[PDB]
From a paper:
Svi3-3 represents the first structure of a phage-encoded SAM degrading enzyme. Svi3-3 forms a trimer of ferredoxin-like fold alpha–beta sandwiches, where each subunit has two helices on the outside and a five-stranded anti-parallel beta sheet at the center. The subunits pack in a triangular manner, forming continuous beta sheets with their neighbors and are each in a ‘velcro-like’ topology where residues 2–6 at the N terminus of one subunit form beta-sheet interactions with residues 120–124 in β8 of another subunit. Prompted by DFT calculations producing high energy barriers for a hydrolysis reaction within the active site of Svi3-3, the TLC assays and NMR show unambiguously that Svi3-3 is a SAM lyase forming homoserine lactone and MTA.
Author numbering:
A (entry chain AA), B (entry chain AA), C (entry chain AA): 1 to 59, 64 to 129
The structure:
Amino acid sequence: SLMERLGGGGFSARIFVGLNVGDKPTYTIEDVVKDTIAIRKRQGILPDASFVAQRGVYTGQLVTENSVQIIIIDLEGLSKEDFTGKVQALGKELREDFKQESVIVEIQERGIVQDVYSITAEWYE
Amino acid sequence: SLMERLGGGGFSARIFVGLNVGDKPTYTIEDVVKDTIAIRKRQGILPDASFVAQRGVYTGQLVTENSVQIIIIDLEGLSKEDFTGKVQALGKELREDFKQESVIVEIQERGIVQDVYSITAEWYE
Amino acid sequence: SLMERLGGGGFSARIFVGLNVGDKPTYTIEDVVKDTIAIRKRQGILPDASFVAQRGVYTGQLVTENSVQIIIIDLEGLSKEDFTGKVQALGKELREDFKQESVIVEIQERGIVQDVYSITAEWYE
């Protein structure tokens, strides 16, 4: 076994996606992973990512929903803003593909949070 | 979709709660989430939080238990010590509500760990 | 309940292990936890660790696999390199015990990533 130190950290991102339309359980974690590979394939990047399941509670009223935590590592060796741009594009497309009111995107470097973007739908009301 | 940068990080906390009394599986993750909303409701804060399931191994002997990872974000915009105080209150009440011998509380800012508090029961022996 | 501040963080590590041989689902999360206690028992360290389940997607072709996230805390109070050495030994042995092509090892301190080691099999080809 060859042990190689890839570095001190690098850029990573985390995307949180709910599975409810309003308050109805609708999508599964398998829906989000299959749709995440498809989006990043069209981006040209390697769609390599991992997914963690979560239980969520949020508020207007209080809903309990299942959510999915998406972890992306900057494997293709991009700059921070080319990497941030595609993650934000993935989050924006993920919010539409699952009719979410909001999607959180959090960019990290060596585990330290650099930015946390809010992707909110502008539904007319 | 409106993309707004909420900031560079903020304060967050993580609470780890076991599900065993001594060595007997007793509680589920649904027990911890329902009891976590109830506590933070009485605190006045928005009870918004997410929950991740875990498998645990700890030591006196070695027990394997299911545990729950609770993630709290400082959404209400508190100072670090008003936020830390309520998390520590939530952890202290969670340890009693599930008869835990110990509960770990870890405060973060932008993902960097600031403090890790130990909440241990003082059972007479 | 006695609340004691253990410190500002400490050393922690994360080990990611897949469950597929090539592309066939083979092992479960229970296989990895039982084998992780056994290895760290032989290391002399307290085998205390937690385990999180994951869904994985990686690329040569694209495979979808279940994986396990192993979280280790420096409870025994070692130096960074005695702690790093045993984690790397655990990762190296874990890669063999489950016939993995690669295993990622990531050392943290107070949540900040210090090193990310790659443990790759040198299969002759």
